[PDB]
Structure formats: C-alpha cells, structure tokens
Design a protein around this ligand. Sequence first.
Ligand code: SF4
Lengths: 80, 42, 314, 98, 105, 169, 156, 110, 70
Amino acid sequence: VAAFLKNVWAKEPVLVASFAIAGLAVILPTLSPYTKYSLMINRATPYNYPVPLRDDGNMPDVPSHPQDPQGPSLEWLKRL
Amino acid sequence: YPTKETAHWKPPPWNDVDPPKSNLTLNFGPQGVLRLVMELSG
Amino acid sequence: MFMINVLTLIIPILLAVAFLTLVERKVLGYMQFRKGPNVVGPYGLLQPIADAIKLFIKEPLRPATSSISMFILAPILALTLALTMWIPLPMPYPLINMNLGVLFMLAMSSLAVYSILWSGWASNSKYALIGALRAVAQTISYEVTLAIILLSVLLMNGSFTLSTLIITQEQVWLIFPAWPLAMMWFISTLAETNRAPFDLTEGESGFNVEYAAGPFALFFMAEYANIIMMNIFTTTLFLGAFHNPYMPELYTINFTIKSLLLSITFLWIRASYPRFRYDQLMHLLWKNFLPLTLALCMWHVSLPILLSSIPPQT
Amino acid sequence: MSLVYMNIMMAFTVSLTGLLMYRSHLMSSLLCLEGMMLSLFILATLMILNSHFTLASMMPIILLVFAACEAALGLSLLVMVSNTYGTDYVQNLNLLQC
Amino acid sequence: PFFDVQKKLGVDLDHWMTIQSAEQPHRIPARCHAFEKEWIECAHGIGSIRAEKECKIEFEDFRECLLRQKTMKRLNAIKRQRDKLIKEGKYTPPPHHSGQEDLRP
Amino acid sequence: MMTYIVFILSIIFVMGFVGFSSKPSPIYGGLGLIVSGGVGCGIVLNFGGSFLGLMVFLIYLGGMMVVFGYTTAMATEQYNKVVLGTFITGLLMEFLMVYYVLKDKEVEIVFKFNGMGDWVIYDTGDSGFFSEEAMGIAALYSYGTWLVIVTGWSLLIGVVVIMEITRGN
Amino acid sequence: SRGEYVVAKLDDLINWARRSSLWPMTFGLACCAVEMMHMAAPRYDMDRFGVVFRASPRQSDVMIVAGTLTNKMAPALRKVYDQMPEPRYVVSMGSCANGGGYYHYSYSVVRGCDRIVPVDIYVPGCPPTAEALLYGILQLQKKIKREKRLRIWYRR
Amino acid sequence: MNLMITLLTNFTLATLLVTIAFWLPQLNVYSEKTSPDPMGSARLPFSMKFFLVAITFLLFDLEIALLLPLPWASQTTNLNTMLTMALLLIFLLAVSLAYEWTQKGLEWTE
Amino acid sequence: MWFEVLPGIAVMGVCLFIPGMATARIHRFSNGGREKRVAHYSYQWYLMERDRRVSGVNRYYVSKGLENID
Ligand code: SF4
C-alpha cells in the first residue's frame, strides 16, 4: 500500500492531491463540531415577518414584548 | 405484388451491411527557405 | 448626463489599449537587453498615434470572402462584447450596478467566440477555418474551467454581485484562502485571450489574416481591451483594495496600480516561455486543471458548512 | 390572455412548420427543433414568473438541460451521416425503402 | 398503468411541485393561492365527474385569477369608452389622473 | 409606445424565427437563432427572470449554439426563391396579427388574445429582501433531490452514449 | 492659398505617419538574412525606430530582399509582392539582390531582383553591415518623407 | 434604460468604427488584383476529435449550469441535504470525466 | 535605462484612473452630493419610491428630516 502511494506520488501528484482534497471535503463535515452552528445561523435569519399569535389565555412560553425574557436567545451568535 | 414504381427495388443484403462506397495533403510554399509537401492523417 | 459617463468609460479604454501596445513594446524590449520605440516621440509616446494613422490609410485587402455579412459582423461583435463587458466593473462604483454581474461577464465570455467562428468561416481559406476551430475549442475549454473557478470563489463570496467582492475582502485578500484557484484562474484567463504561451495562430494559420488593416486593428483593440479587463477582473476578484466611501480615489488608485502590475505580468509571461502545443494545452486543461478544479469545488462547497462561515445572501 | 403569449405561440408554430418541411439539410431541421425548445422555455418561464410560482422556477433549467443533451445526441447522428455519404443531405437517408 | 410506488412506500418525490399552494421556500405565496386552495378543498375525494359538475364556480374563479380574461376585457371596455368620450369632447381627465396629485405618503 | 416594449421585443422574436424557419443556410439560421435567443433573454429580463435570462445567454447561446455552428463549419461547404418567399409570407401574416390586435384589441386564432400591453397583468406587491425566482432555483438542492438525481444520471448516461455511438466499432 | 497649405500639411502628416511606422517583411534566403537578424539584435535594434521584427506579409509595408534570388524562387517572390498592400516598397540588400554578385554568371541565378520587382533602395555589400542596412532603412524613411502625393492630387 | 442606452452606444460606436475602417481608404485610387493556401484543391477531411471535445464541452457546460446556483442554495435550512446533493453533482461530473479518461476519449486532443 | 518605460505606464494609469473618478463624481453630482442608492431587491426600491413620493420634488435624494412632521 505504501509502495503504491509513493509510486502515484512520484508519477501523478496532481491526481493524488485532487483525491486527497476530495476525501477531506467528503469526510470533514461529519467530524467538525461547527456544522450545527451553521444550521442555527441559517435558522436565525429573519427573512419573513414574525406574525404574532392571538392570546387564547394560556401561552406561558411565548413572550408579550420583543424585549421580554421569553422566546429564543441569541447570545451564542453574539459570542461564538 | 410488384408494380411499375417498385420495379427497381432490390432485396436487402443478408448481413444488412452495405458496401462502404483519404489522406490530407498540404503544400507549404516558400513564403533559410524551404518548400514542404506534407501528407497528414488528421 | 449618463451618456457622459458612458463616453468617459469607453474612450479611455481605447487610449489605454493604444498605450498598452506602446507599453508592451517598451517592456518587452527592455527585458531582452534592448530598447523599445524612443525615436518617433519623446520616449516613443507618439508611436500608437503613428501606428493608428498608418493602419487607417493602408489599402484594404478586399479578400474573396464566401460571405460578406459574417466578414463585417465579426469585428462588430468583437468590439461590442469587448466594450459592453467593462460596464459592471466596481471601480469602486460600477456604471451599471447589477445583481448578477459575474454571470453577465461569463455570458459575454461564452458569447465572444462567435467572432472567431465567423472570421474563420468568412475567409475562403480552409486552413484559416482549421485554425479558427482550434482556437474556438481552446476558448470553450478554458471557459469551462473559468466557470467552475468563478463558482467556487463566489460560493466563498455568497452572491453574484460584483460590488460585494469589495465588502467580502475588507479584512484579508481572497488570494490567501484561494491561492490554487488564483493560480489556475490566472492561467485560464491567460489561455482565454490567446495570450502567450497559449497562442497558436502565430505559430505553424491565422483566422484573421484575410482581414484588412482596419478590421485587423479593430480585432487588436478588442483583444487588448479583453486583456486589460481580465486583469482588472482578477484584481477585483482576488486582490481587492481598501475602499473608503468618502474618498473613492484611494480605491481607484490602488486597484489601478494592481491591475497595471498584473498586465505587466502578462507581458512578462509573454517573454519567458516557449509556445505550447495544441494537444499539450488540451492535456493541461482536461487532465491537470479539471480534476483539481472539481476537488477544490467540493472543498469550497463543504468548507463554509463545517466552519460556520456561510456568508450572507445580501 | 396577454399579447406575448400569442407571439410566443406563433413563434412555436412557425418553428414547427419549419421543422415539418425539410428543404435540403438536416442541420437546419435540428436548428428548428432547438428553436421550438427555446420558445417552450420562454413560454414556460413567462407563465411561471407571472403567477409567482416560486418552486416551479427550478423547472425551465431542466427543460433546457435535458433537451440540450438531446441536441448533442442529434449532432452525433448527423456526423455519422456525414461519415457515410459525405454530406448532411436528407435525400441520402432512403436505404430502407426496400 | 399508474403504479403508485410513492404512496405505497411513503416516499415523496414530486408531490411538493405538483400544485401551487404547496409549501414554498421562505413561505412565499403565489398570486392565486386562495382560489386554488378553495378549488382543491372542494374537489378533494368526490371524483372527477362530481368535481367538474359541482364546484365549477371555484374552478372558474381560479381560472379567472390565473388568466384574467374578464379583468382585461373590462379594462378594454373602460379605456375604449373613455377614448370615445375624449374624441367626442364630453369628458376630460381629472388632475389626479394627469400627474399633479402629490400622492399619499 | 414605451409601455409595449416587451410586445415590441416579441415581434423581433417571432421575426427571428422566420429567419431560420425558412432555412436559408445553417450559418444564417444560426445567426437568426442567436438574435432570437438574445431577444427572448430580453423578454424574460423584463419579467424579472434575470438568472434565467443569463442562463439563456450562458448555456443556450454560448454553450449549445456554439457547438451547433462549430459542427456547421464542418459541413455545408462554402461557395433562393423559396427562402425569400416563405420569409415574405411569414412576415405578412405576422404583421397581419399585429395590425388586427392593435386595431380591435381582441383577436382569436385558437385562444382569445387581448390587445392591451403586457404591463397590466403585473403584480403590485414587493418581494422583500430576496428575489423569489432566485430562491426558487436555489431550492434545487433542498427540495429537488429526485430531480437532481435523475438529471445527473441522465447527463452521465448521455456522456456514455455520445462517446459510445461515435466510435464506429 | 489656403488649399495648397492645407494639402501640404496633410501630406506632411500622412508622410510622417507612414514613415514612422514601417513594418518590414524580410526574405530569409541567404547570408544577408543573418546580417538582417544581426541588425535586429539589441545593439542596433530596428524596433526602436518603429520598425517591428518579422511582420506578417499580409500587413507589411516594405519587403527586404536579403539573399540570392534563383530561377526556382522568383515566381514565389513575385506572388508575395503582388499580395502586398499598397503603399509598398522594396529594399534590395547585398550584391545578390542587386546584380547577382558572386553568382552573376550562373545558369540558375536571377541577375538582380530588379528584373522581378521594382526596387527603391539598393544596399551594397556582401554582406552589407547592420549599420549599412539601418542606414538604407533610414534613407528609405527620408525618401518617404519627401513624398508629394496630395500636392500632385490637388495640382492635377 | 441605462443598460439599453449603453448597449446601443457600444453597438453604434462599433459599427461607426467598422464603417470607417472599411470605407475610408476605399475612396483612394489604387490598382486591382487578380482573383487568386496549402489546401486549396483538397477537400476538408472530417476529424472526430474536434467534434468529440465540442460535445464534451457541451455536456460539461450543462452540468456547470446545473451546479451554478450553489451560492444562493448555501443559505438553506436543509444543510445536510444541500451538501449531499452538491457533492453528488460534482462527484457525477468527476465520474463522467474519469470515464471519458479511461475509454481513450481524450486522445490526441488530451 | 529601465525607467524610460514609465511614461507609457503613467499614461495608462491616468487613462485607467479616469473612468472610476468620473463615475464617482457623476454619481455624487446627480444624487444630491451623496452616493447613488443601491436597489438590489424590491424592498429597497419600495423605500426609494417612498422617498421620491414623500419629498414633494419627485427627487428621491431630497431627504425630508424631522422638520416635516407636526
Ligand atoms: S550578397 Fe554576399 S552575403 Fe549577401 S546573400 Fe549574397 S553571397 Fe551572401
């Protein structure tokens, strides 16, 4: 195996470099712990209007004001 | 049922292969100096 | 008022390509132990004017063209796509601010080969037709590699807007995270404009040999405008400058200096290497450049995902 | 309906009548077929962008690519014809009458 | 034959693109979302014959939203009558239809 | 007369089709198709389809018609009444439709066509901070998994088929 | 008068433009071509005069016949001269192009290239030095400078 | 309107320059030339390699068109599916390139 | 010596500096002494049209401040 790898590194370095880059690109997202950060960065972008909900009488988790403590927070994106 | 129109129609070949029915030549002029006549194949 | 802007865009292009011919002759001459033109004007500053007046009063060839429509139309399309292609350039503010300026420039790059094709067809010599076919094949192959490299770099950028490239390069240049793409982009733009060591029609025929002195001059103007604009595009894409919204002249001077250095690098490359063969440059593209382009495209697709480095859409 | 719908449908109709009446060549008929595909592209994207059908905007690109792939196949067949009789005339493709 | 592989296997391959009132990126609505929604909730599960004979009103409304035949027909009638009365001299355009309105915002 | 701009462009579009429906020569037919493609790109540009118009310029004209003319240059060796006749005929019928629909504002051949401008059927709203057609195309990977799979398999099969059938052996 | 002055200045302008941008088409036949390339060398440097190196025959102004013109070669030279755009000039360099030189009495040598093409400047030598050929080119520039085409057109 | 004006200005400058270059020395008085290239009498032979690289360019251009909207598509919410489909598209492009490589497709125009 | 090529590069640099400076000065002159507004999406165009409709001059660059309210 090591003789073959040195042989192709001797004859065709371009293909070896291309295959190494492709393998890194295909195995690295599954190992880096920053993909979830990309996911919730793309989730937190407000493209649409956050249309309010009618207060039936029992919604303790939803806030009543934008500056209320309820709702999702964004301190992780502020720090990262 | 042959008619006048379909009188020259020949039967197809048994293997259904028909007879297949060149080398390019260039002349580089004297435009030291040399005249070359080249025969290519692509 | 806007036509004044259009004229101040398009007339300095012609002045710049005439003095680019002068600068090419001088810089090429000084690199091989001699001088360039310094007799016609003070340090040869009147050389392009004399060349233009000489070329515009020479007798036209009047070749026996099969078609006169394509013969007329090829310089028309060449000059039109040379001059139209300068308008979305953010220097630092573009003439026409468009959402998809990169795609616009790629579309005109793909469209520019019809001048070569019609020039090859209109000439009655079939050897010129063969040379035009080879030039067309080279141009479309390097069009493919240009498109893939541009796609990966813009995926780092995040949008097709050309003015956003100044914003995304405020901290550091894009030649630092994308230097293999930078090298391959530079070679691809070198081979796109039939520049040495990728020109073939000069070596053993040309497609535009049958044109008169005037139409040959117009083809020369189109090619040199393409060279200057391609260097400006490389400067904007990889070597962006510091932009101050209150003093745009800082950005103008900076990217002008950088694009001048890149054009001098083009002339420098012209006087250093022997000519490639046709099959050798096909081998360089299809067996060397393309696998690395696809690998780096996969890498630049996956890299912002795994690094939380996705750029904004706007 | 709108005026441009009439114009695009008329363009499709004249390209169809151009395809159905071969003159001498086969490349001309192939060009007529690609003109038909282009008119289909324009009609489809006009209808899609008029009604703000968001997802359907992915469609005409496919309508290009597949049909464009077909065009490549057609060109190859023409070349094979040009390898046999030396020309792309349609009056040489009559070996199967008998 | 129409082998419903998708409904048997529970997979989704092209149902997201079949209709216009489906789920869209960024919840972008089409111009005829309500009309097609009403037609679909009428004709669901009653068959094609009952669908084409029972809620022709909803289908006519959806087709009118889609192509706008009657709207531009009414516009043609209004513009033609306005041009005829302009030629006959019995009508003039108001200042707010001439370009001196100093509009709302 | 400015408000009919798309309609005006559409005239040139169908005019360009009579450029190659008459089939004068593959080079002139290709030129007519190039003009028609540019005009159609302008037409879809006036409707908001910028990416699709640049798809027309990048892939149809610069990608496929280049190969069509490139193969044309390997045939129809360089050196009629019918071409001019059908060109004149098609132009006459086309201007007949133009005159009739500009006269009575409502014609019919197969469908009922209206004589007003194209500007009437436009939308009065705003799309916000995104282009709807741009995200519709961008949903090719998020939503169109099956379409991507079948298109990629088709292109790979097409490559195999093309290099197989021209071997001749 | 006004018109005579105007055509004189226009003739001077076009004469300067034609004489300051000479594009030569050499004929690499014999020894004199090697001396021509020695004139194109960095020491003498024709290119600083606006005289480019190895221009195409389809766009060139002046033809430099440098070498021996044989009987087997002369129709090609005449074809090249006939396919050159006006205004055109011919410079004969070396004894072979002038009058045959060493091979004047040969059976297969054209005794002078003036029998085939009209020659403007005769450069003598065997080979004439690179300074001599540069001097001949400068003398051709002087000959172009004193042209009077527009004056003849206005006077006729 | 600005883009149309710029296009018309570039086009009219181009045809003015072409007309000037093609007609200004036509008014001069000169002498005409006879109606008469290495392959004047020989016909042009077909070469399969140029047509093959043309169709290869066309197919790679179509897959480039498919791969193009990735900058817009990277801002999605199904990031795993988008990454998988992008990698699959480029992998199929590389597979087509390698299959053309192995079957002597890139021969003598490599 | 090598610096005799510098007049040509200076002329080229002037000719390349001209279009950017001209475009910036034209944009500042034609838009009330400020940058030309970028309208890449429909929301920015809606804002620009609102300023044009609220200015009373039919010029979007005449920005009405806090003096225009009660
Ligand atoms: S003149 Fe003398 S140097 Fe010149 S080609 Fe003749 S023999 Fe050689």
